[PDB]
């Protein structure tokens, strides 16, 4: 009788494939042909933030587009004013093997974590006048790879244990858990409304999650290898994924299919980080070959390079207001690009 | 304000100079073979921080990259080891590490453990590794087995390195093991400098 469910699965899969083919009317290339090419994107370094002692794993800006937090495996969070290159804070971490860091939207807290399997939440505003650990979120069984605040009281994390989790900060507990990936979840990205989020894992698939309901709504495949990086398109109706197969791919949520591939014969290294510009006409990818590429995300033609690092580009970030790009690198520098 | 800002910056950079002094005087080691255990020890007033990554999920290809700049990877193998062929598993892991592009300049201190287990067993090994019937040493039987395993590892090791990293194998008594790690890290740094000056 076990064949009944095998047949149910066969039929459901065939129906999904047929409904997928049905919707493929045109291709992004086609609908875009007339569009003007972006041009040539010549950005320059405007700041070199120096002071980290070892490679930088993660950075996150902060909604004011002036302060940014960076995490280095030298064991430091540094909070920088980017206008003046002055260090606002230097937080020493209990565990040095940090892999992600988040800047809360209100500016009052930062969050970090890594191989310690903990998400630590640090307070930045105290009558005393010193940054202290306000919370430790424990409950994951693999390394923390990414975290993001929904607000001062909630934070969503992703782990090498193949799960994501929503946490209530004041009580230290794990309200919702998101399961369904079969590989390490490497990156998450909050939808600009914070009701959904997408995750990309080492099973070459990306999943869409409802935060309240707590279940998986859609799955996306098409990459050949691990997805290292994921970032929502600014209107929350599509996302982009960078992989070890040396491509980027753009996926639409309501078409339920891959829309675009960004690859070149000469590029044979993996993507480490992705981020859209403010309008989503440029896609910025960091690579293992020490560069960043700037893709015209509507035409799939490479429009620029950022070559200012001597080691792996680990992280990218675009400011909320769209004025600056930050690159972090294994050479232990941050560069601001305009 | 723009004055207090420069003051706080000066203060932070004082602290950072101190931190740098500390950081560059400590040596980080990856032990291999609640997310991460951490051990500290000191030999001849040189400080070491060895990290044991238990608490991960046995797909290593992502988190191993955190260790691209340690002074050394310590790789422990249970040589003698429903019996599964675990020696070929250890060899394949060693080979993946040796040829990973982010670990290429990292040297590996190789500990071959349970040599008494071997001394008792060899009296099971030629079922796998049939070449063990032709190999000769560079009782005699346990010596042969032991050195044959070492040579499999060193064959993988010399096949690809090309100068930038080496393998330091030992047959494994804590005191002596820490002294071995110390002397090998010293050799590693000396060889890095000697190769920078084009003397190796």
């Amino acid at each position, epitope marked *: 009788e076990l064949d009944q469910l095998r047949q149910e699965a066969e039929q459901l899969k065939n129906q999904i494939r047929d409904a997928r083919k049905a919707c493929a009317d045109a291709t992004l290339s086609q609908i875009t042909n007339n569009i003007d090419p972006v041009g040539r994107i010549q950005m320059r370094t405007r700041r070199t933030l120096r002071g980290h002692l070892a490679k930088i794993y993660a950075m996150h800006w902060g909604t004011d587009s002036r302060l940014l937090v960076s995490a280095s495996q030298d064991g430091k969070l540094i909070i920088w004013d980017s206008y003046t290159t002055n260090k606002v804070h230097a937080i020493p971490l209990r565990s040095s093997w940090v892999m992600t860091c988040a800047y809360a939207p209100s500016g009052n807290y930062v969050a970090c974590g890594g191989l310690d399997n903990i998400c630590s939440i640090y307070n930045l505003k105290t009558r005393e006048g010193n940054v202290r650990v306000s919370r430790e979120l424990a409950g994951h069984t693999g390394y923390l790879s990414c975290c993001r605040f929904l607000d001062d009281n909630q934070i969503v994390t992703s782990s090498g244990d193949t799960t994501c989790a929503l946490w209530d900060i004041e009580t230290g507990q794990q309200t919702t858990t998101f399961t369904g990936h079969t590989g390490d979840v490497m990156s998450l990205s909050l939808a600009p409304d914070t009701r959904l989020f997408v995750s990309g894992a080492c099973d070459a698939s990306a999943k869409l999650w409802d935060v309240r309901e707590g279940m998986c709504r859609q799955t996306f495949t098409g990459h050949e290898s691990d997805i290292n990086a994921i970032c929502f398109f600014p209107n929350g109706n599509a996302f982009a994924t960078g992989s070890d197969d040396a491509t980027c791919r753009l996926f639409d949520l309501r078409a339920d299919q891959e829309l675009m591939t960004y690859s070149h014969d000469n590029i044979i290294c993996g993507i480490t980080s992705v981020s859209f510009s403010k309008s989503g006409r440029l896609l910025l990818a960091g690579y293992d070959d020490f560069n960043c590429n700037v893709w015209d995300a509507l035409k799939a033609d490479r429009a620029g390079v950022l070559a200012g690092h001597d080691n792996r580009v680990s992280c990218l970030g675009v400011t909320d207001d769209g004025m600056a790009v930050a690159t972090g690198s294994w050479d232990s520098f941050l560069k601001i690009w305009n | 304000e723009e004055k207090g800002q420069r003051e706080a910056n000066k203060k932070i950079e004082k602290q950072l100079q101190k931190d740098k002094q500390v950081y560059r005087a400590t040596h980080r080691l990856l032990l291999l073979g609640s997310g991460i255990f951490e051990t500290k020890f000191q030999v001849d007033k040189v400080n070491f921080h060895m990290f044991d990554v238990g608490g991960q999920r046995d*797909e290593r290809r992502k988190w*191993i990259q955190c260790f691209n700049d340690v002074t050394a990877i310590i790789f422990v193998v249970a040589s003698s080891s429903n019996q599964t062929n675990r020696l070929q598993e250890a060899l394949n892991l060693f080979k993946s590490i040796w040829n990973n592009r982010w670990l290429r300049t990292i040297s590996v201190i190789l500990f071959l453990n349970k040599q008494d287990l071997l001394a008792e067993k060899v009296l099971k090994i030629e079922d796998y590794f049939p070449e063990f019937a032709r190999y000769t040493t560079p009782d005699p039987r346990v010596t042969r087995a032991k050195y044959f395993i070492r040579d499999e590892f060193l064959r993988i090791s010399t096949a690809s390195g090309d100068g930038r990293h080496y393998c330091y194998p030992h047959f494994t008594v804590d005191t002596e093991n820490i002294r071995r790690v110390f002397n090998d890290c010293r050799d590693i740094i000396q060889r890095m400098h000697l190769r920078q000056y084009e003397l190796l």
Partner: nanobody
Amino acid sequence: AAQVQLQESGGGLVQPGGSLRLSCAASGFTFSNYKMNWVRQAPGKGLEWVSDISQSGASISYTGSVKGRFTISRDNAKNTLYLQMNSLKPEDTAVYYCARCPAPFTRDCFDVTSTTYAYRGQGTQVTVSS
């Protein structure tokens, strides 16, 4: 949406000493860019690497138990991996999986024997007995 598929076939029941030819059809990726492996799991045992072939077909490696009896081949034109099994012994009864290496254009091959590796097939059962 395309997926990474590794479908094995050819397994069956044979006598000790007989021959089998295992095939693995690949889909979803560019076959030529990837190192390929055969792995197996026996009754009450872990996953054991059996063999691997490189992108072009030049480099080959075997676990000792089979060297001399098993021959791995790749047909890059048809996206197929083959294992020719000769003079089979009753200690080969197992399930056999074709495992792709995680990343292309690479020399290291991590995690292809792990319990929940993603780029593996379902398997094919080989049973050597009378």
